[PDB]
Amino acid sequence: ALDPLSETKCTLKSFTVEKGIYQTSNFRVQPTESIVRFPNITNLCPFGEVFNATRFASVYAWNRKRISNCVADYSVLYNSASFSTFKCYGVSPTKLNDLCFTNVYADSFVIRGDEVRQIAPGQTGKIADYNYKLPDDFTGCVIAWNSNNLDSKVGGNYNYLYRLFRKSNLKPFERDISTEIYQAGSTPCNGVEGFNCYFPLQSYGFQPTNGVGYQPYRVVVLSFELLHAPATVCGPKKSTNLVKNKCVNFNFNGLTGTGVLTESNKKFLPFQQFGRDIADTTDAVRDPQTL
């Protein structure tokens, strides 16, 4: 890299270069600036409402909270020491601050410890089959922490239930709250329990003296909606000023890229967020903070 001839010498792995033209390198303009542009929303996301909820739902009837149009400070969660399980699939917790999403769904419920592992893509068991199913392509964070101090009592807490029987496995995020008598055999039950006619639900035995495997764990599952819409749920990351007619490393709503931003003459319709190409390559953007 001393001189061009030296580049050539290295390219040809030869000290002697013959007459000719030799392609040795690939020139590129390096970006001068880093641009971050996120929509100017100041609204913390109500994560406490979910995490600091006094009562959780039974796993069979898991609650779903939708999060939208707010700045999510994810540090509050991954820097907290409150959680035994904080498993993120298809995303990294550190990276979360720099990402936007159309919607986030916070699915809250309670299970026993040994079943926490069933809250993950493509797992099997009572929970994963009949109570709560995560898809194989789940892009989200699962948070679980022991709640023996809260959900267990002397005598056994039986308020939390789980579905024990079902005619088929649940589809991802399919919620079944039916109490229909399970027909285990060939005889119709007609809503009457008996032989081969069982109640589909069953209580959890939560005593403080229970094995950690059988102790209660509160679980909140965050599902990030990576869809083509204006992204509302954004990280705390600070927006900077727009720079035009320069090679810059730009970031619009967590969309990375390096390019020269120029005022466009394209006739975007009001709803259209950004433009693509013949080749399906992004080639135009509508600014988040500015129209």
Binding site: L227, H228, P230
Partner: protein, 192 residues
């Protein structure tokens, strides 16, 4: 009665701008030259999606109910435009048999032909709409621009109209090749 939707029911599939390109997309679209049941109020079923076209110069049709039982103890979406405001609510309403609480959402906004696509399959309700001045269902091509993406997550298997000739068609999952002009407007489509 029945008419044919010659090439009506085309909308912009996503919020991406494309110009001077032919782009193939698979979505719930109205099949070309499909039957539209014509009405001059009934509890019509909602399938994958529904297309509503109303030819109403005097603008009698104010809104639609979308729901399952369309009664109490099931969240039933209501859209009622009244002059300035297109009131939208998803309360468990107790409806009338012939109409004309627990609110989890609320929003507030024949020559006249209004075409509307309602699709609830994304899991949030999508409305696409276009108004075209006209001279049955007209022969020609229009693209419907999205209006509102209500993140309501209401289960809808049936719909009613609140009131004027209106034609109802059903969206089906079909691949469509769409032509975009210089301005990125869908000007032609092919039902594959």
């Amino acid at each position: 009665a029945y008419t044919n939707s010659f090439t009506r029911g085309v909308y912009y599939p996503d919020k991406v701008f494309r110009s001077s390109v032919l782009h193939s997309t698979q979505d719930l679209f109205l099949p070309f030259f499909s039957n539209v049941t014509w009405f001059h109020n009934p509890v019509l079923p909602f399938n994958d999606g529904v297309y509503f076209a109303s030819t109403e110069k005097s603008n009698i049709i104010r809104g639609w109910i979308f729901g399952t039982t369309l009664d109490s103890k099931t969240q039933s979406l209501l859209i009622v435009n009244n002059a300035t405001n297109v009131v939208i609510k998803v309360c468990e309403f107790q409806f009338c048999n012939d109409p004309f609480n627990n609110c989890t959402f609320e929003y507030v906004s024949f020559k006249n032909l209004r075409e509307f696509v309602f699709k609830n399959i994304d899991g949030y309700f999508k409305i696409y709409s276009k108004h075209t001045p006209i001279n049955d269902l007209p022969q020609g091509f229009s693209a419907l621009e999205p209006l509102v993406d209500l993140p309501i997550g209401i289960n809808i298997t049936r719909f009613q109209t609140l009131l004027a000739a209106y034609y109802v068609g059903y969206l089906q999952p079909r691949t469509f090749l769409l032509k975009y002009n210089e301005n990125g407007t869908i000007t032609d489509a092919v039902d594959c």
